[PDB]
Structure formats: structure tokens, C-alpha cells
Amino acid sequence: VNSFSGYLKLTDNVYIKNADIVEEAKKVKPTVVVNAANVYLKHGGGVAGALNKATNNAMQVESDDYIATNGPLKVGGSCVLSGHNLAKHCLHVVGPNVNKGEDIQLLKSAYENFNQHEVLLAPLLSAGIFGADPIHSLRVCVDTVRTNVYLAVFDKNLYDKLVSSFLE
Ligand SMILES: CC(C)[C@H](Nc1ncnc2[nH]c(-c3ccc4cncn4c3)cc12)c1ccc2c(c1)S(=O)(=O)CCC2
């Protein structure tokens, strides 16, 4: 029902909250939840692991069937699959993993996938163990996405740093 609450409004279409994306998906039941995926859709850890565990592995089984028939995605690409019990759809988006030497310029392409959906619940792409500068990821989101994006960032110090940096 896209009933988001407790978000700071950064711009006319970008919102942010200190929260676990899985708990937000359970509360809101959004039309679209974004997964911070990798090209073979192996949802073992981080955000992807948390979303998969909350579907009791249904997301991993569906992703394996997709990969068997279609092969891996490309960095900057995306795939709409079922949202299972968390949302109507899950938009699996592959941002660059700069810790594994992938090109940071593809982060704009990764965020461009969001523009196909009027409203989305999403994590901060390529942050955490993917190694992108999270302040830069927030700026790319703000400059690229025109649809309504509700960012859930599950770390108080990072959330505070992002808000302070944006408001400078
Ligand atoms: C910067 C981080 C604070 C942020 N983390 C998160 N942001 C939003 N919701 C989250 N839930 C959990 C979580 C993790 C275990 C777990 C176990 N039971 C419940 N859980 C929930 C983590 C998480 C973040 C954002 C983007 C990326 C990553 C991490 S990554 O390291 O997975 C690589 C892909 C890109």
C-alpha cells in the first residue's frame, strides 16, 4: 500500500530513514522493493541475504530458476522478479562493486532502473562491502532518480553522516 512513515524528505522525490529494508518492506508492503543484487543473483549476505531469509529462501529458488534459463545480469542492469511476501515485485539491481574493481561510473546506470517504477523502497546502491563512497551514491541517486524513492539505511552513524552531508 506504499504507506511509508518516519522518513526525512531530502528532495521532492528522495526520502531517507535509519531502518532495516526488511522491516520496512514488512510494514509497508510496497509495490517494489529493490535488492542490491550481484550478476548471478546469489543472495548470500548483506541486504540480499536479509531479503532472501525473510522470504524463507523463496527468492533464492526463484533467482536460481531465472539464472538457469537466462544467464547472469550485467553490472548496471536489473531484473523484475516476484516480491514474495515482502512486496508485489522485487527489482534486482546490480550496482558496481568497487572493492572488486568494478567501474563507479555504472552506478548512474544502476539507479536509472528505478525510473521505470513510480515508487520504490530501496537500499543505498554499492555501499557497505561493495565499497562505493556512500555520500557519492546518495548524490547519484538524487541526480538520477525522478520517481519516488524511499531509502532505508540500516546504520545510525552512516544515516547521520548522509543527512549532515546532504544538508551542507
Ligand atoms: C551501508 C549499509 C548500512 C547497508 N545495509 C543495509 N541497509 C538497509 N537495510 C539493511 N538490512 C540489513 C540486514 C543485514 C543482516 C540481517 C540479519 N537479519 C536482519 N538483517 C538485516 C542490512 C542493511 C548496505 C547498503 C547497500 C549495500 C550493502 C549494505 S551490502 O554490504 O549488502 C552490499 C550491497 C550494497
Experiment used for this model: X-ray
HSE toward the beta carbon, residue 151, CA cutoff 13 A: 28
Give the whole-angstrom CA distance, residue 76 versus residue 47.
17
Q: What are phi and psi of 147, to 5 degrees?
A: -85, 175
Sign of CA dihedral 3, 45, 60, 123: positive
Closest of 59, 135, 65, 137 to residue 97, by C-alpha: 137
CATH number at residue 32: 3.40.220.10
Give the whole-angstrom CA distance, residue 81 versus residue 3.
22
Q: How far is the CA of 160 from the centre of ligand 1 (A)?
A: 16
- Cell triple for residue 47? 541486504
Closest of 166, 150, 148, 152 to residue 15, by C-alpha: 150
Q: Which domain holds residue 156?
A: 2-166
User: Is the CB of residue 22 below 6 angstroms from any atom belonging to ligand 1?
Assistant: yes
- Stated in angstroms to one decimal place, the resolution of this structure is 1.4
- Cell triple for residue 145? 532518480
What stretch of H or E contains 36?
A: strand 32-36
User: Is the CB of residue 152 below 6 angstroms from any atom belonging to ligand 1?
Assistant: yes
- Number of domains the chain contains: 1
Give the whole-angstrom CA distance, residue 57 versus residue 82.
13
- Cell triple for residue 24? 520496512
User: Is the CB of residue 135 below 6 angstroms from any atom belonging to ligand 1?
Assistant: no
Beta carbons within 8 Å of 26's beta carbon, 6+ residues apart? 54, 86
User: Is the CB of residue 158 below 6 angstroms from any atom belonging to ligand 1?
Assistant: yes
- Ligand 1 atom closest to Cα of 20? 9
Instruction: Please answer whether residues 141 and 4 qualify as being in contact, where contact means their C-beta atoms are separated by less than 8 angstroms.
Output: no
CA-only gyration radius of the chain, Å? 15
Q: How far is the CA of 116 from the centre of ligand 1 (A)?
A: 24
Q: How far is the CA of 104 from the centre of ligand 1 (A)?
A: 19
Give the whole-angstrom CA distance, residue 40 versus residue 44.
11
**Amino acid, res. 72:** P
Give the whole-angstrom CA distance, residue 53 versus residue 60.
9
Beta carbons within 8 Å of 142's beta carbon, 6+ residues apart? 10, 11, 14, 166
Q: What distance lies between CA 70 and its chain's CA centroid?
A: 22
- Cell triple for residue 99? 572493492
Instruction: Please answer whether residues 1 and 134 qualify as being in contact, where contact means their C-beta atoms are separated by less than 8 angstroms.
Output: no
